[PDB]
Design a binder for this molecule. Structure first.
Ligand code: HEM
Ligand code: HEM
Ligand SMILES: C[C@H](O)[C@H](O)[C@H]1CNc2nc(N)[nH]c(=O)c2N1
Ligand SMILES: C[C@H](O)[C@H](O)[C@H]1CNc2nc(N)[nH]c(=O)c2N1
Ligand SMILES: CCCNC(=[NH2+])NCCC[C@H](N)C(=O)O
Ligand SMILES: CCCNC(=[NH2+])NCCC[C@H](N)C(=O)O
Ligand SMILES: [Zn+2]
Lengths: 420, 420
């Protein structure tokens, strides 16, 4: 398009016009000469270790947000609008920061999710539950908030989206951080015999916990303890109450032998290592949760080489011809492993969505966003499922990726920085 | 990287440094604000209908290429180098164009393939057979060349890569074009009963052929006739000799009932609608061929909704639970359909490669290119297979995409333009 970019769906021939990209100022990492669309973390905003924004650079951002917030409630330029701007303005010059009103925080959180270009489950964005933990001051208080969140979101298996927001960052008072990558994950332990017990992706973190005294069960699926850091002080270990951690034993609807594989997984995915930015303010601790898309577990978590990597074993038990990749034994065990995962969760009545339904609703969500918002930033590389790509509708959908704020950003690991 | 960009493999932790991107001048379609990496044909160079380059804009391009060609043979700045430049120079000012020496044409073709960022089979790039058809002047001559190419490349099933290059374009003398999208493809016919017989992707072309008198067999897998245009004159219909068209009846190594599905496909993929650009010169007719990667047929050709879309039928015959997408019946029939394709080709001893071997050799190719060329332009969106993405190594490989020349470009369909 001359000024209005268009994305086409090649399976349905549907075309959409994107104008929403015009309000993006953050950089993508690409240039007119190179495309970095497949790079994991282009440091364009991967959050620096580098201090905190200053009073000068903070007000423009604070304003951009408020202008947007009021424009959404069609009150742009109102006395209220102008009053709030001056409020914050003065509030920043005096205290070097500012506080979001409960309403602005809820709008900011929802939009950080609405703007998450890598999220395929955004059709749910406006149905997020926000828990305000900005009054929290200690690690025990953080533990309590997280426990209440896990209980709420799990809802006995009928998962509900939620996010708990702790105190924003400040010059030096200090940072609240949840050292865990996800609220619920399994430990990983290296074994001199070359092998790795548990989840290989959590080995260096499990080490930290052990260093902090965690009594590791040295098992396969050991739910790790929470390592909470409040007001910049050293983190503390906490054990999430077992009765609060819902898990699902993995079994197959045909292969009774599948059970014996000893496969199990937790039902609540809860990312706790990202950063939420709203009006220049940075919330380094903002754990949030939704529900699983089957492939996340069956394809990536179980079959990723660097993860549990269960493909061989599963393949042996099926007695497949593993002497030639051309037999597609990996592809076959993969489909079964995922049929099991979906079957298991559904039996235990635990909320889960298959990649066919998820991608289907994302196309619907996209159409809703282009109709009501002028577009929808989407990352094709991440939106398309790790298995059966072309049989899902998103594979055939052209997507425009750009960065909007509020947003969720990556941030340095706290231990690769935290002192003493 | 500060000036040197890096791509990481997240499964193996291998990092590579790209410097090769620095010699790209063509635009990708992205900006620092928007990423268009998932857009099919960004008109950045999708070849305009707009005339032909002029003497002025043609020499810079001609030079850039020759400088590169001699630099490759470590003869940059040689008398030969300088002599050739002046040759062409004068040759352009006088005849408004120039002729590539056989050696430059072979180097240009190989590199257009070497630079094809969307091609996963580039490890073979330097083993391409070039057929010089620049002396051709008629459609019958074009037919002969194409027949000799098909015979050569098929090699009785032991496929060999090749490309046949016809006369380059000139101001007005005229264009040589192969109206077919691929040398070998099946016709598509619309049926008032809503359905479509054959390949839905070839309906509008099949119509043209019929309009030109083709005696369509009105079948399912009807090999279309060649519609050749030489020196800008109207195209002519030609029937590729049946004995020259190798096909493979699709059957399964377990499901004897698969045979009865009536599935068949040709063994030689031969793209004939792209444009080859070497030193500013445009070769609008340059059909080229290699061999199939299984998924191209089993996943896209057979299971694409807008293609043969055989998923239901195949699923019924397997008696799968098609009442819920959550049963993953589509994924399952998909794996079987592709096991069949690979099995079938291998039995008939016809060259074919599975997505596991293809992606494996592309990672090796990438490492070879970063070691010897400073990098390798790759399009992640296209390199990752349409099924079982994350279990193949390219899914986990960060890729940098940029445009280098010589290259293969898209060009307008000849009928949506050709006159009388
Ligand atoms: C309702 C259930 C939801 C589903 C099915 C869903 C699904 C997904 C999936 C499949 C991914 C890919 C993650 C990966 O491959 O590692 C993702 C990424 C993401 N989602 Fe959602 N999501 C949901 C809810 C949420 C919520 C409640 C938020 C925030 C309020 C959110 C924010 C994001 C973000 C920030 C990413 C990007 C992660 C990254 O780039 O590392 N999602 N989501
Ligand atoms: C040796 C066998 C080869 C294999 C296995 C192979 C495989 C592939 C695959 C899987 C694609 C994706 C095409 C699609 O999805 O439609 C592709 C694209 C492409 N290949 Fe190769 N290729 C081979 C040889 C060649 C040759 C001989 C040339 C040229 C000299 C070439 C040039 C390209 C180009 C230009 C594209 C991009 C097509 C587009 O963007 O529409 N390939 N190749
Ligand atoms: C290299 C490449 O960017 C990387 O492997 C990406 C691809 N797509 C992905 N998509 C999702 N949803 N999650 C991931 O972790 C990835 N990894
Ligand atoms: C919209 C999206 O770009 C489109 O569907 C792409 C994705 N990847 C692809 N990859 C290959 N090899 N071939 C294709 O035709 C496509 N289609
Ligand atoms: C945090 C709510 C959204 N979560 C989600 N569905 N996917 C991303 C987090 C889960 C993580 N990829 C895992 O498989 O363990
Ligand atoms: C032209 C040689 C390379 N061809 C190839 N392997 N793939 C692309 C062309 C085949 C086309 N996508 C098809 O499935 O019909
Ligand atoms: Zn890009």
């Amino acid at each position: 398009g001359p000024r209005f970019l268009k994305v086409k769906n090649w399976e349905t021939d549907v075309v959409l016009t994107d104008t929403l990209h015009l309000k993006s100022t953050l950089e993508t990492g690409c240039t007119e000469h190179i495309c970095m669309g497949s790079i994991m973390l282009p440091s364009q905003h991967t959050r620096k270790p580098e201090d905190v924004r200053t009073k000068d650079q903070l007000f423009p951002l604070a304003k951009e947000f408020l202008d947007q917030y009021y424009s959404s409630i069609k009150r742009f330029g109102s006395k209220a609008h102008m009053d709030r701007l001056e409020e914050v303005n003065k509030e920043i010059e005096s205290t070097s920061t500012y506080q979001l009103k409960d309403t602005e925080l809820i709008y900011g959180a929802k939009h950080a999710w609405r703007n998450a270009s890598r999220c395929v489950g955004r059709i749910q964005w406006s149905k997020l539950q926000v828990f305000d933990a900005r009054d929290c001051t200690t690690a025990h208080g953080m533990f309590n908030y997280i426990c209440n969140h896990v209980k709420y979101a799990t809802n006995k298996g009928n998962l509900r989206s939620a996010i708990t927001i702790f105190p924003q960052r400040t010059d030096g008072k200090h940072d609240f951080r949840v050292w865990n990558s996800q609220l619920i994950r399994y430990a990983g332990y290296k074994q001199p015999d070359g092998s790795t017990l548990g989840d290989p992706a959590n080995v260096q973190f499990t080490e930290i916990c052990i260093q902090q005294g965690w009594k590791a069960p040295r098992g396969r699926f050991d739910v790790l303890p929470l390592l909470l850091q409040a007001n910049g002080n050293d983190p503390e270990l906490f054990q999430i109450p077992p009765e609060l951690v819902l898990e699902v034993p993995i079994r197959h609807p045909k292969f009774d032998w599948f059970k014996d594989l000893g496969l199990k997984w937790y039902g609540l995915p809860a990312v706790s290592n990202m950063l939420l930015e709203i009006g220049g303010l940075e919330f380094s601790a903002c754990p949030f949760s939704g529900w699983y898309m089957g492939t996340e577990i069956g394809v990536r978590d179980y079959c990723d080489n660097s993860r549990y990597n269960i493909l061989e074993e599963v393949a042996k038990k099926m007695d497949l011809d593993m002497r030639k990749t051309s037999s597609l034994w990996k592809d076959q065990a993969l489909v079964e492993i995922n049929i099991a995962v979906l079957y298991s969760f559904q039996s235990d009545k635990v909320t889960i969505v298959d990649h066919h339904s998820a991608t289907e609703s994302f196309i619907k969500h996209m159409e809703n966003e282009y109709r009501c918002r002028g577009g929808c930033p989407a990352d094709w590389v991440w939106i398309v499922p790790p298995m059966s790509g072309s049989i899902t509708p998103v594979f055939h959908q052209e997507m425009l990726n750009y960065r909007l704020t509020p947003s969720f950003e990556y941030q340095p690991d706290p231990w690769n920085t935290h002192v003493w």
